[PDB]
Design a protein around this ligand. Structure first.
Ligand SMILES: [Zn+2]
Ligand SMILES: [Zn+2]
Ligand SMILES: [Zn+2]
Ligand SMILES: [Zn+2]
Lengths: 287, 46, 143, 55, 56
RNA sequence: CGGCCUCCGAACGGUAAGAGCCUAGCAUGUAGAACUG
C-alpha cells in the first residue's frame, strides 16, 4: 500500500498524523489473505486504530478500510448500496469466495488506483436520500475506548489509566450492539442499517394527491424576494409549467403544470430543499 | 528411562490369534496384568 | 545469603555503616521478586524491581556525592559487587537527569519513533496533568 | 577487550617451570625426521606406511 | 547505547512464566515456540564458557 | 636392530482405515455504536 483508506472520523484531527507500518501484518477478514497494516494514533488519549481490510477488499465496495462506512456518504453499506439501488453479486462460500477474491485481485491489478471497480461508478448517482442520511460532523466518539470490565465490576485499580471508558455498559438487548464485522461488510442484516432504513423512511418527503387533474402545486413559505420568473426557473425546464400564482397575501405559490411527472420531479425533489435565495418553500399539490 | 511400550501382539492377545504366526515380531501373550504405569498412577491417586 | 562476595578482598572501611541498609534493601528486593502476579504481574510485574534498584543506587549516590560520608574505594567495591549502577550514576551526574528513573527510560532505540518515554518530558510542557505511566518502570515523571 | 599481551621474562620463566609437566622436552625437529606432515603426505600418496604412523 | 539491567529483572520474568501453562502469558506461547530454531546457538554459547575447575 | 592389531546403531517397512458423536483446549482479544426544528 501507499496509505490507508478511511473517513475523516476514523482518519483524525491533528494536522500531523502518526501511523506505523508493518508489511504483511495480518489477514483481511474479506480477502482472507495477508495485508499491510498501518496503525494510526487517532486522538489525544483516543484508541490507536489500524487498517482492517485489504486495499482490494476496499476498492471492491468503496468503503472505509477502518471506519467501514462508505467514503462518499458514510452510511451502512447496505444503505448506500440500496440508495444507489445497487445489487452486488459477491460470492460467499469458502472455495467460491477464494476463487472470487483471486480473480478479483487479478482484475483490479489492471486498475490505476483512482476509483473503485465496476458498478461503483455506474451507480454514482448519489441520491438526495443518501445525501440527507449522510452525517454532517465528525462523530469522533469512535476513538473512545471500550468498557473497562474491571471498571464495570469495580476492579480497574490502575487509577485513571483504565484502558477503557469506565462508564455504564450498554444493555446488549439493543440491536445496535452485536453486528458481526463480516456481516456488516457483506451487508448482511445490519440492525444499524435497518435503523437507517426506518429513519430515511420516516424522514419527511413530499406527499402525492389523489386525482390526476390536481395539477396545481402549492409552495408554502415564499417571501417577497421571489419573482414569478424565479419560481419558473425553479420549475420551468423540469417539464413545462401551465401557470403560477405567487400569493403575496399569504407568501406562497402555485404551479399548474403541463406534465404531471414533471410536476412530480420538480416538487418532490424540491421538498423543503428547493433553496433559491435561501427561503424554505414547501412543495405540495394544491387544492 | 523407562522402556514404556511392551510388544504385545494385540491381535493375538485379544483374539488368541495372530495372522503372522511364527513371524509376529511381537510377543504372543494373552496375559492381562497391571502395567508399569497403571500401578504407579493408581497408588499415587490413592 | 547476601549477594555472596566474589572479589575475596576485604571491603574498604565505610561498608559497615551502609551495611544494614544494603542488607535490608537486598532482602526486600528478594521478597518483591518472589512476590505472585495477582494483577501486579504483566506490565507492572517489574514495576517493583527497578524501584528497588534505583532506590539502592540513589542511596549510594547520596552517600558518596551529596554527603561525602564514604570513601571512594569503599564505594568502588560496592559498585563492583553489583549493588550500585555505574552507568545510571554516570548519567545521574548530568544536568537534566538527576532523577532518571530507569536507565531504559532514555533508550532511544527502545521505541519505534526514536524518542524517550513521556516519563522524561517535564510536566510543565504537558500542562494536561493526566497521570503518566511509563510502561517500563511505571514511574511518574522522573523528570 | 583482552588481547595482545606483553609479559616479563621473570613471569615467563616461572610459568614455564610450572607448566613443565604438560610439555615436550624436545629442543629441535631432527626428532621428527620421517614423522612430519610432509612425510605422511608422501606415504598416503604412495600407499606405504611408516612403522608407527597412520594408514 | 543499549545498556545492561539488574539480573533480578530477567529472573523475575522467568520464574514468573515458569512453564507456560498459566493462561496469563498465552502469547509468549507462540514466541517461545518460534525461539526453537536458535536453541542450538544457546547451547554452544553456554557450553563453551564453562567454569574451568579452579574457579568456583 | 627391529616396530604393522578392520569393526561397534537407530528409524520406516509390523499389529487397519474410517464418518458420526461429545466435550476442554486452542485461538479471538478486534471493528463499530443513533440526532433536530
Ligand atoms: Zn502374532
Ligand atoms: Zn519510561
Ligand atoms: Zn521508566
Ligand atoms: Zn521516569
Amino acid at each position: 500500500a501507499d496509505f490507508p483508506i478511511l473517513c475523516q472520523t476514523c482518519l483524525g484531527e491533528n494536522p500531523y498524523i502518526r501511523m506505523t507500518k508493518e508489511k504483511y501484518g495480518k489477514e483481511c477478514k474479506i480477502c482472507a489473505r495477508p495485508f499491510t497494516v498501518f496503525r494510526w494514533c487517532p486522538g489525544v488519549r483516543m484508541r490507536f486504530k489500524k487498517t482492517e481490510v485489504c486495499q482490494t477488499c476496499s476498492k471492491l465496495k468503496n468503503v472505509c478500510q477502518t471506519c467501514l462506512l462508505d467514503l462518499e456518504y458514510g452510511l451502512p453499506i447496505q444503505v448506500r448500496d440500496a440508495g444507489l439501488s445497487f445489487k452486488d453479486d459477491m460470492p460467499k462460500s469458502d472455495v467460491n469466495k477464494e476463487y472470487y477474491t483471486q480473480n478479483m485481485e487479478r482484475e483490479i491489478s489492471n486498475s490505476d488506483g483512482t476509483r473503485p471497480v465496476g458498478m461503483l461508478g455506474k451507480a454514482t448517482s448519489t441520491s438526495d436520500m443518501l445525501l440527507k442520511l449522510a452525517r454532517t460532523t465528525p462523530y469522533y466518539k469512535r476513538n473512545r475506548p471500550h468498557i473497562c470490565s474491571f471498571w464495570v465490576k469495580g476492579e480497574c485499580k490502575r487509577g485513571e489509566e483504565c484502558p477503557y471508558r469506565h462508564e455504564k455498559p450498554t444493555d446488549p438487548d439493543d440491536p445496535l450492539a452485536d453486528q458481526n464485522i463480516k456481516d456488516r461488510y457483506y451487508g448482511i442484516n445490519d440492525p444499524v442499517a435497518d435503523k437507517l432504513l426506518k429513519r430515511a423512511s420516516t424522514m419527511p418527503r413530499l406527499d402525492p394527491p389523489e386525482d390526476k387533474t390536481i395539477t396545481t402545486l402549492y409552495v408554502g413559505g415564499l417571501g417577497d424576494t421571489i419573482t414569478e420568473t424565479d419560481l419558473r426557473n425553479h420549475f420551468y425546464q423540469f417539464g413545462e409549467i401551465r401557470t403560477i400564482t405567487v400569493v403575496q397575501r399569504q407568501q406562497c405559490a402555485f404551479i399548474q403544470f403541463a406534465t404531471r411527472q414533471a410536476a412530480e420531479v420538480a416538487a418532490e425533489k424540491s421538498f423543503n430543499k428547493l433553496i433559491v435565495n435561501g427561503r424554505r418553500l414547501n412543495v405540495k399539490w394544491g387544492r | 528411562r523407562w522402556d514404556y511400550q511392551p510388544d504385545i501382539c494385540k491381535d493375538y492377545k485379544e483374539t488368541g490369534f495372530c495372522g503372522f504366526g511364527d513371524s509376529c515380531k511381537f510377543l504372543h501373550d494373552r496375559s492381562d496384568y497391571k502395567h508399569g504405569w497403571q500401578i504407579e498412577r493408581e497408588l499415587d491417586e490413592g | 545469603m547476601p549477594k555472596v562476595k566474589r572479589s575475596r578482598k576485604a571491603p574498604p572501611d565505610g561498608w559497615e555503616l551502609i551495611e544494614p541498609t544494603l542488607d535490608e534493601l537486598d532482602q526486600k528486593m528478594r521478597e518483591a521478586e518472589t512476590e505472585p502476579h495477582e494483577g501486579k504481574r504483566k506490565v507492572e510485574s517489574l514495576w517493583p524491581i527497578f524501584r528497588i534498584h534505583h532506590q539502592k543506587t540513589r542511596y549510594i549516590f547520596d552517600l558518596f556525592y551529596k554527603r561525602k560520608a564514604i570513601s571512594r574505594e569503599l564505594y568502588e567495591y560496592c559498585i563492583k559487587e553489583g549493588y550500585a549502577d555505574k552507568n545510571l550514576i554516570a548519567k545521574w551526574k548530568k544536568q537534566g537527569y538527576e532523577n532518571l528513573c530507569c536507565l531504559r527510560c532514555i533508550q532511544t532505540r527502545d521505541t519505534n519513533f526514536g524518542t524517550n518515554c513521556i516519563c522524561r518530558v517535564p510536566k510543565s510542557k504537558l500542562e494536561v496533568g493526566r497521570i503518566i505511566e511509563c510502561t517500563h518502570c511505571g514511574c511518574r515523571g522522573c523528570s | 577487550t583482552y588481547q595482545r599481551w606483553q609479559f616479563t621474562l621473570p613471569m615467563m620463566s616461572t610459568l614455564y617451570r610450572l607448566a613443565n609437566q604438560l610439555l615436550t622436552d624436545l629442543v629441535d625437529d631432527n626428532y621428527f625426521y620421517l614423522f612430519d606432515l610432509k612425510a605422511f603426505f608422501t606415504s598416503k600418496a604412495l600407499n606405504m606406511a611408516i612403522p608407527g604412523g597412520p594408514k | 547505547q543499549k545498556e545492561d539491567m539488574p539480573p533480578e529483572h530477567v529472573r523475575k520474568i522467568i520464574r514468573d512464566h515458569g512453564d507456560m501453562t498459566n493462561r496469563k502469558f498465552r502469547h509468549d506461547k507462540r514466541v517461545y515456540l518460534g525461539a526453537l530454531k536458535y536453541m542450538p546457538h544457546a547451547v554452544l554459547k553456554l557450553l563453551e564458557n564453562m567454569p574451568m575447575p579452579w574457579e568456583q
